[PDB]
Design a protein around this ligand. Sequence first.
Ligand SMILES: [Ca+2]
Ligand SMILES: [Ca+2]
Ligand SMILES: [Ca+2]
Ligand SMILES: [Ca+2]
Ligand SMILES: [Ca+2]
Ligand SMILES: [Ca+2]
Ligand SMILES: [Ca+2]
Lengths: 361, 602, 602, 184, 184, 46, 46
Amino acid sequence: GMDYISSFDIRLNKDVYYAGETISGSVLLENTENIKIRGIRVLLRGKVHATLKVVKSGERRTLKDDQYVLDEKQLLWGKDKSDESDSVPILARGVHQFSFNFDLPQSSLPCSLESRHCTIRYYFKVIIDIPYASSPQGIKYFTIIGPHIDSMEEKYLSPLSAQDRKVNCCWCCQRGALALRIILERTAYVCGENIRVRAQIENRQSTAQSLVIRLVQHVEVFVEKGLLGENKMMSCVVFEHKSPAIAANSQGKYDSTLEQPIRLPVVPPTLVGVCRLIQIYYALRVCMEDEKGNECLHIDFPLTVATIPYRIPNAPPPPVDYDFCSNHVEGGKYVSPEFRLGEEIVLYRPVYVKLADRRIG
Amino acid sequence: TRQALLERIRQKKEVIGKLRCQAWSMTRKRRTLKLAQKYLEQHESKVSRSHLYMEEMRKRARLMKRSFSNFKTYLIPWESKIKRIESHFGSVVSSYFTFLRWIVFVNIMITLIALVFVVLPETLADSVANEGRFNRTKTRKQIPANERVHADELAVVWHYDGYLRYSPLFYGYYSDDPFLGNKIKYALPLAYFMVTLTIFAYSFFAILRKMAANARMSKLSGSKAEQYIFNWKLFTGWDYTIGNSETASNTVMAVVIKLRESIADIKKDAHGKFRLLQFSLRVFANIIICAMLGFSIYCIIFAVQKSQVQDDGNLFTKNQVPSVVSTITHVFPMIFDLIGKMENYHPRTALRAHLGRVLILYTVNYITLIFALFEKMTALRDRVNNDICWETIIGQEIVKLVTMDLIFTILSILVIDLFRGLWIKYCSSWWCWDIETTFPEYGEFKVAENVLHIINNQGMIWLGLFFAPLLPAINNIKLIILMYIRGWAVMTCNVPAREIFRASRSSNFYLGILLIWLLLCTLPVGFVIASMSPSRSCGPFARYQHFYTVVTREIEKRVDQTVLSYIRHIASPGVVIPIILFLILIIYFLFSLVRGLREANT
Amino acid sequence: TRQALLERIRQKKEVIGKLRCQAWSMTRKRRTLKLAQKYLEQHESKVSRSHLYMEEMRKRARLMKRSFSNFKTYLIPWESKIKRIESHFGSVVSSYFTFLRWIVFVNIMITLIALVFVVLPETLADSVANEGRFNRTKTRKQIPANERVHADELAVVWHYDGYLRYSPLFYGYYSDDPFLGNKIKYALPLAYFMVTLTIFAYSFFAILRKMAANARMSKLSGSKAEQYIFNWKLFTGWDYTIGNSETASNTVMAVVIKLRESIADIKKDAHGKFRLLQFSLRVFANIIICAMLGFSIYCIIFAVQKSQVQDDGNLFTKNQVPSVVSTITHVFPMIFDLIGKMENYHPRTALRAHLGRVLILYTVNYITLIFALFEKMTALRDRVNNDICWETIIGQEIVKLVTMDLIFTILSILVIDLFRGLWIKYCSSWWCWDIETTFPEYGEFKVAENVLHIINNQGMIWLGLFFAPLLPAINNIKLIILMYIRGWAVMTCNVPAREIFRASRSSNFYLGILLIWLLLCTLPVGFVIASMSPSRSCGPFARYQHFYTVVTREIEKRVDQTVLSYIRHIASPGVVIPIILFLILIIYFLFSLVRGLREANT
Amino acid sequence: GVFTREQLDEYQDCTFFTRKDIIRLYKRFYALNPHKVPTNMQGNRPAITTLTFEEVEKMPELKENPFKRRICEVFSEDGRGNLSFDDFLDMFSVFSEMAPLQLKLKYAFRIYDYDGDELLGHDDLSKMIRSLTRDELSDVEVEFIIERIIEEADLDGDSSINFAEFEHVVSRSPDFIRTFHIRI
Amino acid sequence: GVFTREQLDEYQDCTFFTRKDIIRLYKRFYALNPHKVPTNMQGNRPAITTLTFEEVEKMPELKENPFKRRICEVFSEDGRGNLSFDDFLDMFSVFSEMAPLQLKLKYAFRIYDYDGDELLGHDDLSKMIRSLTRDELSDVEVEFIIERIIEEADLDGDSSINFAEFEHVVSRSPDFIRTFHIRI
Amino acid sequence: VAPGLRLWMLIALVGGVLLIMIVIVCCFMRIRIPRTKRQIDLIAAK
Amino acid sequence: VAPGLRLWMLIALVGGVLLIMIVIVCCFMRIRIPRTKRQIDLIAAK
Ligand SMILES: [Ca+2]
Ligand SMILES: [Ca+2]
Ligand SMILES: [Ca+2]
Ligand SMILES: [Ca+2]
Ligand SMILES: [Ca+2]
Ligand SMILES: [Ca+2]
Ligand SMILES: [Ca+2]
C-alpha cells in the first residue's frame, strides 16, 4: 500500500565493483505510522532473460527462458516463516536503515547486457512482506565486471603474422599481382587502446584498392525449450575503417601508430562460454575493395577484449574515467519497455571505462 | 660426469617417448617439448662426431617411419563405414568388421605372394613361348576340339569345366619344364612348391603376430581376476561408442536389468529346483542334436557317393555336394539356436553351448568332406588305372564349394534380414498374433556365427590354394562382396540386441579358432605332398614320383652322400617320439610357469 | 535338515583336518579334538543306513592309510647316518644323501620290475628245461667245452667273459621260444619288451611325481620373488639342523661375512674395472677348457677304435676303453677347479660355470662313446657277416664301464680324502710352507660333482638295461657301497666348508638334470629298437627282422587290416613334420606369452 | 597451409594422430561453427578459438553420452565452459584406440570424480549411478549398489577408491578398452 | 604299549608322528633325566610330567642353537621354566619336515619376537641379531641392518612387521623350509 | 540364338544390369526398414 | 696252485679277508682324522 510507505531507498557507497570484492549497501525505509509487518528481506539475483520469436506452421510462438546465476539471501528484519511465535515485532514510526554485506564468488560471472532477445541483470530485491496487504518490492541494479581476462596469458603475448598474394591471370604473366603482408604484435586489446599494426601492400592491377577493416559483433542467442530448439543468428558491423588508396602498379606501407590512430569503439567485452544462454564474439574482417565495390582476399581475425593492459611493474596509479556506453554498439540500441517512465531518461544503463584523450595543457 | 650426462639423456628420452602416455595439458606438453629441444641443442656441442652420426641416423629413421605411417593411413579403406556401424550399433558388432578387414589384408598379401612368383612368370613365358613350348604345353593349355563345342552350356561353365578347366585358375595349366626360359633360369616347380610353403608360413606369421600384439602389448593386465562383479558391470558398463538414442536407451535398460538381476541373485543365494520334465527336455534335445549331426554326416556321404561320374555324361547330379554342404552350414546353426529355447539357462553359457555345437558341426563336416573326397578320388584313380588330373579336379571341387557358399550366404542375408524385415514391417499390423513381440522378432546381428563363417571359408581357401593358385585372388572379391552386403544388411534390416554377451570376453578367442583351423588345413596338404603320387599328364610335378622330390633333387645335388645318409637317420620314429615327448614336457614346464606367474599376479 | 547336517559335517571335517596344521597350544588342540569328537558322536545318529555305511567305508580307508604309513616307516633305512651327517656338516650336505637314498629306492624298484617279470620266470623255466629246449638253447646258455677250461684267467672273468657271459645278466641268455612253458604261456620276448618300456615309464613317473611334490605341494608360494635380500640373509641365516660347536661357530662367522659383504656391496654401488691381463687369462682359460674337452673326445675315439678285436687275441688292450673314459670322468673335473683359479669372480657364478663345464664334458663324452661303440659294432658285424652277438658285447662294455667307474671312485675317495687328510695331519708340523693355511686344506665335500656322478651312473644304467637285464642289480650294490663309503669319508676325512652355496637354490634342479639325462638316454634305446636289426644267434628277438615286431604281430592278430592301414597313414612324415612345426610355434608363443605374464606380474 | 611443418611435427609427437587425422579433426572443428573458427588457424589461433560446451555436446559422438558435460569439463583448458581446438585434439587422442591403457585409466579416473580431490567418494559414485541409469533406480537400490562397490573394491577400509586402487581394480576388466574408446 | 590306544591315537591326530617316532621321543625324554620321568606313563602322566628348561637345553639338538631359550619359552605351557612331554612333542613335531610351510612360518614368527605383543619391533630384531651374530658386529652395523630390514619389509609404514608381512616376505625364500628343520 | 547356349547369356546380362541398377539406387538412399521403438510402442499400445 | 687260474683267486680271498677285517674293527671305532680349529689356533699362537 502506497498510503502506508512514505520513503523507500537503497544506497551504496560505490556503484561499480570488481569480481571477488565485498559489496556493502543499506536500505532506508521511512514510515509515518505503525504498520504490522511479518518481515523485510533482501535477496541477490543475477538473471539472464531470453525471449525468442519463431514461426511454426504459420503460428507465431514466443519462447521465454531464464537463468539464475547468483542467488544469495539474508534476513534483514522480522521473523522467519518457520517461526511459529505469534509475537510479531513492530517497527517504530520514523526512518530506519538496514545495512548488508555480501561477498562475490571468485568464479567467472557473465557481463551484464541489455538487448531485445537477451538481458543479463544483477540486482538486489528488497521485499517487505506485510499481512493483509500487497508486499512492496524494491529492485536495484548494478554492473558486474567480467569475465576475468588477464593479458599476461601466454595465448595473447605471441605476435601474429599473415600474408597473401593473388594473380588475376596465368601464373606465367606476373602482371596483375596483388600482395599483402600484415603483422600485429598481439591479439588482446583494451577498450580505447590503440592497436599497433604494420603492413606492406603491392598492387599491380589497373584500378586502385582500399583496405577495408570491419569489426563484426556476432551475438548468438540459443534457447533449449523445444524438440529441436531455436537459435538466433545476429550479425552487425561495429565499425568500418578504410585505408588510403594505393596507386596502380605500385607499393605502399601502412602503420596505425604512424599514420592515424585506428579508434576502437566502446564495446562489450568478449563473452564466450561464460553463460550458456548467449554467445558474443568479435571478428575483424580485412578485405580489399576496388573502385567498383568488389571484395577479395578476406582475412578473419578473432578479437579478444581484455580489461588489464600488458603491465610491467612501475605501472601508473589505477583511476581511469567511467563514461556512458555508446549507442552504436549492441547493448544500447534497445531498452526494455519496463525501463522507460512514460529528452528520454533511462533508469539504468551500462557504464564502461575509458582513458581521457590527450589533454594538451 | 659422463655417467651423469648419459643418465640425463636417458631421462630426457624416456620423458619424450612416454609423453604420449602422460595426462598433461597441451600447453605443458609443448613447454616440455621445447625444454627438451633446448636441452638437446645445448648438449649437441658436448659429444663427438660418432654420437652425432648416430643421432642423425636415428632422426632419419624416425622421419622415414613417420612418412611410412602417414602413407599407410592413406591406404586403409572402409574407415567411415566401420565408424558409422560402430556409432550406431556398438563396439562389439564392429569387431567383426575390423576382423574382416584384417582378413582381407591377409588374403591380399597371400594373393600377391602367390601371384608375383607363380602366375605372372608362367603367363609371361606363355606370351613369348616358342613353337616347342607350345607343342609341349598344348595338352594342358588348349581345350580339345571335341569338347570345345560344349564349352558354354549353363552347366559346363557353372561347374568350372570347359573354358575354366584349362585356365590359370587351376594347377594343371602350368608347364613341366624345369627351366622357364634361357638367360633367366626360373625353376617353375620349385617356385610353385616354395610359394605353397611360404603362404602357410606367412599365414602362421600373421596370426601369431596379431595374437602376440593383442595379448602381451594390449591385455597383459587382465590376468588373475576374481569377483569384482559390480565393479565390472558398473565402472565399465557404458559403451562410449554408441551415438544413437534408441541404442543408448536399450543399453540403459540392459544395464538396469543386469544390476537388478545380479542383486536379486546375490540376495537370495538359493538355487533349489528339480523338474523331471525339464531334465527330460534337456536329454531329448541333446539326443536330437546328435541325431541331426549324424543326419548331416549321412547326407554329405550320400552326396559325395552319388557324384560317381567322371565323364561329362550328366551335370544335374554332379552339382550336389556343392549344394548340400553349404545348405547345412547355413541352416543347421539357426536350428541349433531354436534348440536353445528348450535349454533355458544363463545367456552366456547358452551362447557357449551354441558356439560349441556349431564348431563341432563345422569340424565334423570338414573332416568328413576331406575323407570322402580322398576316398572318391583314390577310387577314381584305381578305376582309371592318358591318366586323369587329380589336382585340377580337387581345385574344381573347392572352388565350387566356395562359390556355392557365397551364393547361399547372399540368399540367407536377403531372406532372413531384408525380406523378413519388410514382411514384418508391412504385415505385423493385421497378423493373427503379436508377431512383433513374439518369436520372429526383427533379427539381431549374430557376431559369433558370422565370424565362424569367415573362419570356415578361410579354412577352405587354405586347404584349396595348392591345387588352384588363383583361389585367394577370387577370395578377395568374395570377401569384398561379403563385407559390403553384411554392412548393408546390418545398417538396413537389423536392430541392436536388447542385451548382448560374449562367449569368451577375450580378444584372441576367434584367432585361436583360426589358428586351430589353419593347422587342421595344413595337415591334409602335408599328407598329400608327402605321400600322394602326382599325375603324369598335368602340372609341373608330372616328371616326379613324389611332390617333394623337386626340393630334395636340389638338396642331394649340392650335399655329400655320407652326411645326407647320416642326417636321414633322424627321421626314425624312435628318434622322433622322444622329440615329441620333450616338446610336450617343455610346454608343460611353461604351463606350470604360466600358472605360477598368474598366481603371483593375483 | 539335510543342508544343516551337511554343513555341520563339513565344518567338523575341516576342524579335524586342520588341527595338525594350526599353530595352537597343545591343550587348545586337545580341547578342539574333544569338541570335534563329541559333536561327531552327537551327529552319528542323524542319518540313514547308506550314509552310515559310507562313513564306515571312509573311516576304514583312513585306517588302512594310517596303517600303511606306519608300516612304511618301519622300512626306511639309513636314518641315524643322515641325521649325524646333517648335525655335523649341515642341511646342504645331507641333500646329497637324501637324493642318493631316493635314487637307491628308484633303482630297487627298477630291479624288482625287471626281476619279477623277466629273470625269475626265465630261470624257473630253465631249471625245468626239457631235452628239446636244452638242445635249442645250448649254444647260448651252456658255455662250450672248448672255452670252459679257460673260464677263469684273471682277465677273462674281469672282462665278464667265461661263466659271466652265459648268465641271465646278459641279453643273449634268454630263449627265442614264443612260450616259456605249458600251462603258463608266458611270452618271454613280449615280457622283455614290455619290461624295457615299463622301466622308462616308471622312471619318468617317479621323477615327475617327486618334482611335483617338491615344487607344487611344498614351495607353491616361492614363485614371483624379488629383493628381500636382508630378510633372506638374516631371518633364514641360521641353520637349525647344525648341532656341532665347530660347525655352529663356522656358520656364525659365515653369516657375519655374508652380512658384511652384502652391506659393503650395497654401500659403494660402483663397479668399474678393466684390466687387459685378466681378460687374456680368462680367454686363455676358456680356450684351454675347450681344447682339453677335445682331447677327451679324441682319447675316447682312439680307445674305442683301437679295440678292434672280438676274439680272445689279447685283453691288456681290450680293457682300455672302460678304464680311460672313466678316468676322464674322475680326473677332468678336478682340474676344472684349478682353471677356476685363473678366472676369479663371485663364487656363485664360478660354481655355476664349473657345473656347466662339467655337464658339457659328461654329455660330450656320453655322445662320443655311444657313437663310437655303435659304429664299431656295426663295422664288426659287417666284417663278420653263427652270427656274432653285438647286443651282448655292448652290454659287456656298459657293465665294465660301470664297474671301473666304481673302482676309480673308490680309489679317488681313498686318495683325495683319506690319504691327503692323513698327510696334512701328520706332515703340516715340519712342512716347507703352511699347507693347512694354503691350497690343500683338508678337503671340502662337493655336493654338485657327486650328485652329477650319481646322475651319470644312473644314465649308464638306463642306456644299458636293455642289453643287460640285471645291470640294476649290480647298480644297487654299487650305490649302497658308494653311500656307505661317502658317509664314512665325510665323517672321517672332511671338514665343514667355510661357505657353501647352491647352483640354483631350488629343490628341482638336480631332478631336472636327471629328467634331461633320462630323455638323452631314451634317445638311443629308442633308436636301437626302431632301426637296428637283432642278431639271429642270441637273445629272444632272434626270430624277427626288427625289435618291435613282437609287439606288432600281437596287434595284428586281434586288429583288422583295414583299420591298421588307416591308422598307419597318420604316422606319415607329412603329418608329423607339421606337428613338430606346430609345437615349435606354440613353444615360441608361450615363451613370449610367459614373458608378458611375468611382466604383468612385476 | 593451415598448419606449419613444425606445428604438424609437434602435433604428431604429442598425440596419436597423423596428418590426415589432424586435418580431419580441423575439418570437424570448422564444421561445428564455421563463423567462429577462421579459415586460417596458423599460429596460436587453436589456443584462443573455443566453443561452448553446449555446441560441442550437439555432435553425434557425445550426443547420447550421459557424462558429456563431465568429459567436456575435464578435457577443457583452465577456462570454464570453453573447449578449444588443442583440448579437442587431446580429448579425441586420449579416447583413440592406439592410446595405451595407462592414459585411458588416468583420464577415466580424472573424469569419474567431481569435487577434484583425487578420491572417489560416496557422492561421486551416487551421482554417476543417477546419471548413467537416468534416475530409474530406487534410492535403497542405489545405496545397496554403492555399499557393495565400496566393500568389494577397497582394502584400506576408507570407503573410498584411490587412483592406484582404481588402476588395480578396473584394469583387469576385459571390456574397458572396448568401452572406453571413441572413433573419430 | 606304554601308551594306551586313545593316547597314541590322539597324539597321532594332533602331531605329525607315527608310533615309532613317539616311542623314540619317549626314549629320548627318559634319557634326559631317568630319575623324574616314570617308566609307566599311562593316563594323565604326560600332562603333569615336566622338566626345567636347562635339562632340555642340554640335549645336542638344541645345545648350539642361539635361540634355545626363546624356543623353549615359546613352546612352553603357561608355566614358566617348565617344559612338558606334550610341549616337547609339539616342539619336535612342528620342526619336522612333514609339517607344512604355514605352521613353520607361524611358529617362526612367534619365536622371533621378544616382548610378546605379536609385533616385531626394533628392539626385538636387534636382540635377535645380537644373539645370532654373537656380538661380532658393531653398533652402527646393527643399526644399518635394522634400518634396511625395516625399510625393505614394510608396506603400511608402521615401522614394524606383522604376521601377514612376515609370511609375504620370507615364505618366498627357498632356504627357509630347508633351515627351519630339526630331525629327531 | 541357341536356347541352351545363348539364352542364359542374355538372362545373365539382363540380371547383371538390373543388379547394377538396384545397387546404385540403394547406394544413394538410406532406407531403414525397422521402425523406431517409440512408434512401435505407440502402435502396440493402441 | 695254478699261476693264471688259482694265484689270482688266492690273492682275491686274502684281500677279501683283509678288507673284512679292516671294515669290522674300523666301523666300531670313531677315529676323527681332521683336527679341530681350536688346535689350529693353539698351534698358530705357539
Ligand atoms: Ca542377419
Ligand atoms: Ca560366408
Ligand atoms: Ca662314469
Ligand atoms: Ca669327499
Ligand atoms: Ca571426490
Ligand atoms: Ca613382539
Ligand atoms: Ca607392517
